[PDB]
Amino acid sequence: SINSTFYLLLDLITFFDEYHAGHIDLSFDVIERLKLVPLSQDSVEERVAAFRNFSDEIRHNLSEILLATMNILFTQYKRLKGSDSVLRSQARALITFAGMIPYRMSGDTNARLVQMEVLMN
Amino acid sequence: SKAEIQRYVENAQNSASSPREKSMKGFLFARLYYELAKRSVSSYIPKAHRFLGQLFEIEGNVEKAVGCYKRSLELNPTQKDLTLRIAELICTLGRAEYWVERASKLFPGSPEIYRLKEQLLSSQWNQLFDLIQAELFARPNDVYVNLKLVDLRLEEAVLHCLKPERRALRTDIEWCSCVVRVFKEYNTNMRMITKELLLAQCDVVFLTLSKKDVQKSKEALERFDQALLSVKQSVSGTDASDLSVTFYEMRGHYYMHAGTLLLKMAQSCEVQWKALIEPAALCYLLAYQVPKPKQGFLEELAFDRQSKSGHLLLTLSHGKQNFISEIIETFANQCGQSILLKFLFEDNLSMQDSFMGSDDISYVENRVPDLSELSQHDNGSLRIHNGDLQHLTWLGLQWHFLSTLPPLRKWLKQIFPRVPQETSRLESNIPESICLLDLEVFLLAVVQTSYLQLQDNRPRCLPLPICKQLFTDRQRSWWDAVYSLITKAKLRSVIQHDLTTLRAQEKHGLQPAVLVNWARGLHKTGYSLNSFYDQKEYMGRCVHYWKKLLPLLDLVKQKKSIPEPVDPLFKHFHNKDIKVSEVKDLEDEACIAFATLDLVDGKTEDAIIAFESVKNVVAYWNLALIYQRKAEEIENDCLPAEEQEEFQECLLKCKGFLKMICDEYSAYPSIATSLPVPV
Amino acid sequence: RKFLASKKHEAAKEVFAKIPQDSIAEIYSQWEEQAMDSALPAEDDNAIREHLCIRAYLESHEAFNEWFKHINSPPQKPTLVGQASFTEKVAHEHKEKKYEMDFGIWKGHLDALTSDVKEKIYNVLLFVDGGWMVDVREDTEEDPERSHQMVLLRRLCLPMMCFLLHTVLHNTKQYKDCLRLADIVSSENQKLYTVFSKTEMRNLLQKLRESSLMLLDLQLDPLGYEI
Amino acid sequence: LVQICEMTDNQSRLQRYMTLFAEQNFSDFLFRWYLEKGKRGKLLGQLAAFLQAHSWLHELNSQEFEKAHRTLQTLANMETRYFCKKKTLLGLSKLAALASDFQEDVLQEKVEEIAEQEHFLLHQETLPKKLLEEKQLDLNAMPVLAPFQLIQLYVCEENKRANENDFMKALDLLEYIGDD
Structure with missing residues (x-):
């Protein structure tokens, strides 16, 4: 358990390095690889059933992870607009996960996620 | 410590002061230190030769690197590579001809040196002479023969068409022969190898490349469908041409791969949907329902394909009322095939041409794969995945889904022919006497553990190429080790530990439920068989399991079952723990095991005395059977015993109790007629 | 204002809450508005209005957070075990019966919470006596830094509160009330078109297209009127 | 025949070849x-279909805020059945004009025509809360009252609170009469 937790810390760190460099593609690939957050509307249930099985330090990183993933989906939608159905499906899945998650996170992050959903709508 | 290194270097410069010439010392000082290294290594001048030559060559000093390499080859106390640099230099400079000839006479498989020799000849054949010598040495070198044809109309075209019709697996020889024909003027094996190749490449990209239902495997399926239509419309194979049976086998395999892609698309997107399994059932049926080509390759491919298609056609609809509905709805003249084709190849392959509209399906009907056909085709598919734990656990779990324990003994007497059926003593942890029951029990336990883990999607098994690992790492390791032992400084700790575990020795890590499933399976399997010298062994082994479990079931008095902080071989939870309720059941089954083990050797008196404790229906039934076989023509007053036991059996059949291995309809009529006529 | 410039909910909450409940009342030296105009400073009354706008925004965000929790709090369906036996059939039937009342209770909860939060949000969108994040006394000396703080608060909360109202309306199926956010913005009394730029009004117009989609699907006209 | 066949299937490559x-x-x-707008090319590649379409909401979707504002000004001038509908239409027109790319002078002239129209619309908007219940008319669902009607309502005896502002309104509403 603690070993895989460390693996999760390493994965989140590398994905954060890519997000801080601007690597939206690899960021999405790593977010899909870690399989912690809802990438599909039906996957909200599975990720929520798994979320109670995480260490509390993972409940400490899930908020920033969700903000970054919503921003990534918004940036991918921006690229597709400036060059989107799957992107909006991912936004709705992120909304479902962040809303049914047992982690009462900062309402401001939910407000910004809803703002991104709107600017995608 | 770099300080100790620098100290060595100080001592080294001193040692070049002292040993004035110091060639090796200077080379080693340059080695300790690129610019100063190159200068000092040039002063010292294999290390000096290679450093100087590579530096000059990469700087473009072909002549200077030639000087270095040629001088090192002329001193030759240790030098190999110098010939290459000398040849390339003399080329870049009549001269390089001899050096390229030397490279060829040291290794006639020299493509680059042969090309350089061709350039030398064009700046000055006889490269065809060197290549004819290479062919006289290694005549199977079709590529050397093609190079000789390239250097060479008669012989060039002969030795180009020959090797092309010898391999044909590379456009190289083909383009060379075409170019030879054009410059001079101015088949079915190829199609077979291309079709056999394309099938393998499709399956490789599908399974091991792990295409996430994206272009990776889909474009290869497009290539496969295109080759299928091409060979179909061009070589509409007649009876005598083997492309007929090859094309039909590839037709079945094409439908199989299409079904696999539909399943994988569903799972990759979200999950095996209700909308991508029906044409997939049509695909797997359109693979099973093609006739057996009756060539070992083709026979085994048909075996594997029909086996897998049957497993999947029974798991996709365990319940009936699907085959006929699928046939009558999802297939038609153009509509069914168009909805099947758009899903495979999205707007990249038109319907009328270059597609599956050409091949017909209306010949197919309703035919569910039979349970004996499936057993024989599983035995046949056991030939091309020999000893794959993944394949064995896959087939085991699929037969388990069929609600029937698989014929493990047939598969194992196929895989491992010589492994003994039993061992003399089960009280010994000895590795070199692996018995068939040990590995069959390992198979069963792994099967049930994977079943519980997968339980903890309309196809439950996710066919062989697409799914994940089915077994755990511990069991994988033990399987590798025991396979390595049987099918031969061997590290056998896993073998010895897991044999301690499997034979249920002094200390084991598994709990009752595993041993109970073992013993039940052993009991039914041995009882089904008729052979005395297998029933003896199998009942001995199952009674062994239950007797080793006997004291284990006794420690269950509001205390720990068996303390296992780490999982040795099999540790799950919330399934194994036997309630105090099931203690009575297991004790009664132990008593009938005792009685029947006592009965199937010749101690019929204590057989009855042992059956005279339990009060179930099988006990009555076995006592009646032994009394009858005892007194066919012995006594009359012993028949009242059959009357009474079968009357109790009738009272217990009134409730419809089906615990008897043979139902009441044939047993109670037999005994009822026997009692009435003798009454 | 400094904490709002970074949207630190707990920080601003502390700043507003640890402050006494008696500050304004104990600061009001003269109650009769005639003398209260004199005693009231262009800075003291302005700070009182700042505290009132802070409280309004805090309520409009806390209520929105509670409504956001309650929106996805909604109950799930009862599990269907294929080929259910008699016991499983009866238990799933009872679970369906209970879920059909759980969803109704959650609907009532949604109605109450959405109504309260929307009331507070509309209060914040149209603060009385000149609007929120605006001083009421013009006789104050030059305070350009704090004036720009209030300007940034308006420019960062007006389209934000509008997006919250649009999302809450969409959630409660208030498509007509969400399309009337256009009139809420263009209202000449509030001049809410002056706090949202072209991009914000563009996103709100796409949200109005979304709301009109729901209305036309529910068979009402683009304005919520009977076709 | 060809444009209907290539629209029945997803053979847009076939339609592109024919083109x-x-x-x-x-x-x-x-x-x-x-x-064939609404018969072929419909959304129900999707975004290409949506752009293939060449009307206020549709002009908003097309990002022609100026055309949407023109249509909304015409719609507000035609809307009299619901004074609320006329006001909302003028508001949408103003928002489209503001979100338009109109030059300074053109936007200012449109804003002046908007301010005159708003001066016309604001006269009725001040209907008193005693007079509304006295006349037993809806809070907002009374039709767009004409200038003569507004003058008569502001000067009627029912408006008990008749004051200097009401008199200023019932005197200023004479410049929208027409055919004096």
């Missing part, structure tokens, strides 16, 4: 999309 093999084909395909 490549035609003179004046882009102008023919655009006119064909315009003609």
Whole structure:
């Protein structure tokens, strides 16, 4: 358990390095690889059933992870607009996960996620 | 410590002061230190030769690197590579001809040196002479023969068409022969190898490349469908041409791969949907329902394909009322095939041409794969995945889904022919006497553990190429080790530990439920068989399991079952723990095991005395059977015993109790007629 | 204002809450508005209005957070075990019966919470006596830094509160009330078109297209009127 | 025949080939999309279909805020059945004009026509809360009252609170009469 937790810390760190460099593609690939957050509307249930099985330090990183993933989906939608159905499906899945998650996170992050959903709508 | 290194270097410069010439010392000082290294290594001048030559060559000093390499080859106390640099230099400079000839006479498989020799000849054949010598040495070198044809109309075209019709697996020889024909003027094996190749490449990209239902495997399926239509419309194979049976086998395999892609698309997107399994059932049926080509390759491919298609056609609809509905709805003249084709190849392959509209399906009907056909085709598919734990656990779990324990003994007497059926003593942890029951029990336990883990999607098994690992790492390791032992400084700790575990020795890590499933399976399997010298062994082994479990079931008095902080071989939870309720059941089954083990050797008196404790229906039934076989023509007053036991059996059949291995309809009529006529 | 410039909910909450409940009342030296105009400073009354706008925004965000929790709090369906036996059939039937009342209770909860939060949000969108994040006394000396703080608060909360109202309306199926956010913005009394730029009004117009989609699907006209 | 066949299936590559093999084909395909708008080219590649479409909400979707504002000004001038509908229409017109790319002078002239129209609309908007219940008319669902009607209502005896502001309104509403 603690070993895989460390693996999760390493994965989140590398994905954060890519997000801080601007690597939206690899960021999405790593977010899909870690399989912690809802990438599909039906996957909200599975990720929520798994979320109670995480260490509390993972409940400490899930908020920033969700903000970054919503921003990534918004940036991918921006690229597709400036060059989107799957992107909006991912936004709705992120909304479902962040809303049914047992982690009462900062309402401001939910407000910004809803703002991104709107600017995608 | 770099300080100790620098100290060595100080001592080294001193040692070049002292040993004035110091060639090796200077080379080693340059080695300790690129610019100063190159200068000092040039002063010292294999290390000096290679450093100087590579530096000059990469700087473009072909002549200077030639000087270095040629001088090192002329001193030759240790030098190999110098010939290459000398040849390339003399080329870049009549001269390089001899050096390229030397490279060829040291290794006639020299493509680059042969090309350089061709350039030398064009700046000055006889490269065809060197290549004819290479062919006289290694005549199977079709590529050397093609190079000789390239250097060479008669012989060039002969030795180009020959090797092309010898391999044909590379456009190289083909383009060379075409170019030879054009410059001079101015088949079915190829199609077979291309079709056999394309099938393998499709399956490789599908399974091991792990295409996430994206272009990776889909474009290869497009290539496969295109080759299928091409060979179909061009070589509409007649009876005598083997492309007929090859094309039909590839037709079945094409439908199989299409079904696999539909399943994988569903799972990759979200999950095996209700909308991508029906044409997939049509695909797997359109693979099973093609006739057996009756060539070992083709026979085994048909075996594997029909086996897998049957497993999947029974798991996709365990319940009936699907085959006929699928046939009558999802297939038609153009509509069914168009909805099947758009899903495979999205707007990249038109319907009328270059597609599956050409091949017909209306010949197919309703035919569910039979349970004996499936057993024989599983035995046949056991030939091309020999000893794959993944394949064995896959087939085991699929037969388990069929609600029937698989014929493990047939598969194992196929895989491992010589492994003994039993061992003399089960009280010994000895590795070199692996018995068939040990590995069959390992198979069963792994099967049930994977079943519980997968339980903890309309196809439950996710066919062989697409799914994940089915077994755990511990069991994988033990399987590798025991396979390595049987099918031969061997590290056998896993073998010895897991044999301690499997034979249920002094200390084991598994709990009752595993041993109970073992013993039940052993009991039914041995009882089904008729052979005395297998029933003896199998009942001995199952009674062994239950007797080793006997004291284990006794420690269950509001205390720990068996303390296992780490999982040795099999540790799950919330399934194994036997309630105090099931203690009575297991004790009664132990008593009938005792009685029947006592009965199937010749101690019929204590057989009855042992059956005279339990009060179930099988006990009555076995006592009646032994009394009858005892007194066919012995006594009359012993028949009242059959009357009474079968009357109790009738009272217990009134409730419809089906615990008897043979139902009441044939047993109670037999005994009822026997009692009435003798009454 | 400094904490709002970074949207630190707990920080601003502390700043507003640890402050006494008696500050304004104990600061009001003269109650009769005639003398209260004199005693009231262009800075003291302005700070009182700042505290009132802070409280309004805090309520409009806390209520929105509670409504956001309650929106996805909604109950799930009862599990269907294929080929259910008699016991499983009866238990799933009872679970369906209970879920059909759980969803109704959650609907009532949604109605109450959405109504309260929307009331507070509309209060914040149209603060009385000149609007929120605006001083009421013009006789104050030059305070350009704090004036720009209030300007940034308006420019960062007006389209934000509008997006919250649009999302809450969409959630409660208030498509007509969400399309009337256009009139809420263009209202000449509030001049809410002056706090949202072209991009914000563009996103709100796409949200109005979304709301009109729901209305036309529910068979009402683009304005919520009977076709 | 060809444009209906290629629209029945997803053979847009086939339609593109037929289009490549035609003179004046882009102008023919655009006119064909315009003609069969709602019969072929529908959204229900999707975004390409949406852009293929060539009316206030549709002008907003097309990002022509100026055309949407023109249509909304016409709609507000035509809307009299619901004074609330006329006011909301003028508001949408003003928002479209503000979100438009109109130059300074053009936007200012449109804003002046908007301010005069708003001066016309604001006269009725001040209907008193005693007079509304006295006349037993809806809070907002009374029709767009004409200038003569507003004058009569502001000067009627029912408006018990008749004051200097009401008199200023019932005197200022005389410049919108017409045919004095």
